Design a protein around this ligand. Structure first.
Ligand code: ZOL
Ligand code: ZOL
Ligand code: IPE
Ligand code: IPE
Ligand code: MG
Ligand code: MG
Ligand code: MG
Ligand code: MG
Ligand code: MG
Ligand code: MG
Lengths: 362, 362
């Protein structure tokens, strides 16, 4: 896509600025500058750029209906690309740390960053921290004199905190809340009582929906100066809805999508994750099915994982996803219609975003 | 100390606000709220609070010479305490991740956070990320309407980036720059050619001096509105000088100070760290001494570590530290005199800070 390649050309500008700054202000050597360049490329590139291209899309919509000088149009489009890369870099930060915590093997067709022989977990923790730090370097440099700077930084902080809190919920989802204790080693749940739709929704809300949909949509509004033209409560509600759906897709693919086309290998069953599939399974399974689930879930053994996948296949969870998808379509369609009242162009942006999310196969 | 207990009372206010916010806005359960409370206490408390009490000290100095209403004095002191805890929380973030990267056992008399049975490395990475995130939650809430907010957030970002870049230099200091490659596993240096005073100074500058001394001193200036009353170039120069000295102390204690009084166990020799002792050793050792160093450094073997410690003891590095200390005293004394020209009260603050740093035994 031509639009996506212009977005990538801004990445090259950002990379050039960040690496020249390390050279000029941080006394870096060429070899460590090379390392961070490879680090930036491996962690930030290779994806679909859904979050980044959302910011551009929202801004392009308002540009079509609002009067600007040609140079102002160039300013806003460049702002949208920079703001888009802030989110892609923020995602990169979370992806790097997430892979370590989940013990993942590959990220978009390549080994996870920490799996690289010359990286290891030791370097990867700090590399992830650097990635988040770059987002702030970007904002202060590029959006220095911009009126949206204060609001952008404030939202970015809240969204980032929400994700970190969300990851906390996710990484401790396979153990009982009442047994949580830093002093005593955490045993895996036996009753799976916290594997409920309500608890699943809490985890997903904070761990993905804030940075995956809320941030890109409001970012595009900030760079367009069009936050007043929308009802924010609707933006929150529609972002959390498509965001949840996005993670449900992710949960299904973790189990049923082959790694060659997915770009990752699944670990949810092995990690005993509170995924959509496990929650939906326990929401329809009979007594014996539950007992077989309890005897095989949360183990690295290929034979035990195979039993869990078999249980999912026999429990017809494909019909449950279709029923869930049909409901999401209803509610997203409803919210897009509500968004048309004050901003039809933003409602169209959400419609495009939803279409891409709904149709995705990776 | 009475002053230190009033500083700790603000921590309780901050902890109450952060935990009530998780309850009211982030849908947290009491058990996970308890976990993060223990996490906050274990990672932020138990230290000397040098960085935190520096902010208070700088502010107290200006309060003694400037006219304010009684309520304004209460405002500034509370600001100084909150700004002080932002740094203590920022240090906590770096301490949590640093211990994982260095494979450390104890932090201030207690097991490192990741060593806790109910924590592990998996949870600790995110806990550290949460700690940094809390610093921004603090700033936006407490310093919302303050005129120094923009400058505080901008400096905090630069200081944080500098530290992360510094940790990168530190964690890769035992391998050759020209051999750095994410694709190929990193072998330890054989010539130790990058163990120079100049390279040591670069690492220390970025990994500690920015957040340990620069940030607390300027933070106290921001809350006092007294940044104009100082020459910033002097503040930079004096903070990087005492900061370097502070890390040299840390390097010496890692080897020669017993864990019972230090609160940590040393790992520098085992990790093959570019510490002051190793650099100073290679700067005076004869051919045979170097060869024995090369055959024993960077190994977990107690016998090999013992040989390295013996080499340090025989090379009389105590006389080298005394010679280094005497030079630092000269240059710190010089800079404090230069600070008296525009702000004598800030110069006194630095003198107190230096006295505490110079006299410290842990
Ligand atoms: O399933 P996860 O949440 O770990 C994941 O979606 C990443 N992630 C982490 C937080 N939100 C999303 P991925 O499967 O991509 O590893
Ligand atoms: O020696 P390090 O740099 O690892 C240390 O001083 C922590 N640190 C990390 C960066 N700056 C300081 P500590 O010995 O306290 O573990
Ligand atoms: C489910 C989440 C939020 C993590 C994966 O997100 P993406 O599917 O956007 O990953 P990339 O395309 O960026 O690799
Ligand atoms: C050398 C550095 C910068 C890490 C230790 O700092 P401190 O000696 O201040 O650690 P605490 O007292 O805060 O535990
Ligand atoms: Mg994962
Ligand atoms: Mg995960
Ligand atoms: Mg997943
Ligand atoms: Mg350490
Ligand atoms: Mg260290
Ligand atoms: Mg040390």
């Amino acid at each position: 896509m031509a639009s996506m390649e212009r977005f990538l050309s801004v990445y090259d500008e950002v990379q050039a600025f960040l690496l020249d700054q390390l050279q000029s202000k941080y006394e870096i050597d060429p070899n460590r500058a090379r390392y961070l360049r490879i680090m930036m490329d491996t962690t930030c590139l290779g994806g679909k750029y859904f979050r980044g291209m959302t910011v551009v899309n929202v801004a392009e919509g308002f540009l079509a209906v609002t009067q600007h000088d040609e140079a102002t149009k160039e300013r806003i489009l460049h702002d949208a690309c920079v703001g888009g890369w802030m989110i892609e870099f923020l995602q990169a930060h979370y992806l790097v740390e997430d892979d370590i915590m989940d013990g993942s093997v590959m990220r978009r067709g390549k080994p996870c960053w920490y799996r690289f022989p010359g990286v290891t977990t030791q370097c990867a923790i700090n590399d992830g921290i650097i990635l988040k730090s770059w987002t702030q370097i970007m904002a202060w440099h590029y959006f220095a004199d911009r009126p949206f700077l204060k609001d952008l930084l404030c939202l970015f902080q809240k969204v980032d905190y929400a994700t970190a809190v969300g990851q906390m919920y996710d990484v401790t989802s396979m153990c009982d809340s009442n047994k949580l204790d830093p002093e005593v080693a955490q045993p895996m749940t036996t009753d799976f009582a916290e594997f409920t739709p309500a608890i699943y929704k809490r985890i997903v809300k904070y761990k993905t929906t804030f940075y995956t949909y809320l941030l890109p949509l409001v970012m595009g509004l900030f760079v367009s100066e069009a936050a007043a033209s929308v009802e924010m409560n609707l933006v929150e509600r529609v972002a959390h809805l498509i965001g949840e759906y996005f993670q449900v897709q992710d949960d299904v693919m973790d189990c049923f999508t082959p790694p060659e086309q997915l770009g990752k290998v699944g670990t949810d069953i092995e990690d005993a994750k509170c995924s959509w599939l496990a929650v939906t399974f326990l929401g329809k399974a009979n007594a014996a099915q539950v007992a077989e689930f309890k005897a095989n879930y949360g183990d690295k053994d290929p034979a035990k994982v195979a039993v869990v996948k078999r249980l999912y296949s026999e429990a017809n969870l494909q019909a449950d996803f279709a029923a869930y998808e049909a409901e999401v379509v209803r509610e997203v369609e409803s919210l897009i219609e509500q968004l048309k009242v004050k901003s039809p162009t933003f409602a169209e942006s959400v419609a495009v975003v939803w279409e891409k999310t709904h149709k995705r196969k990776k």
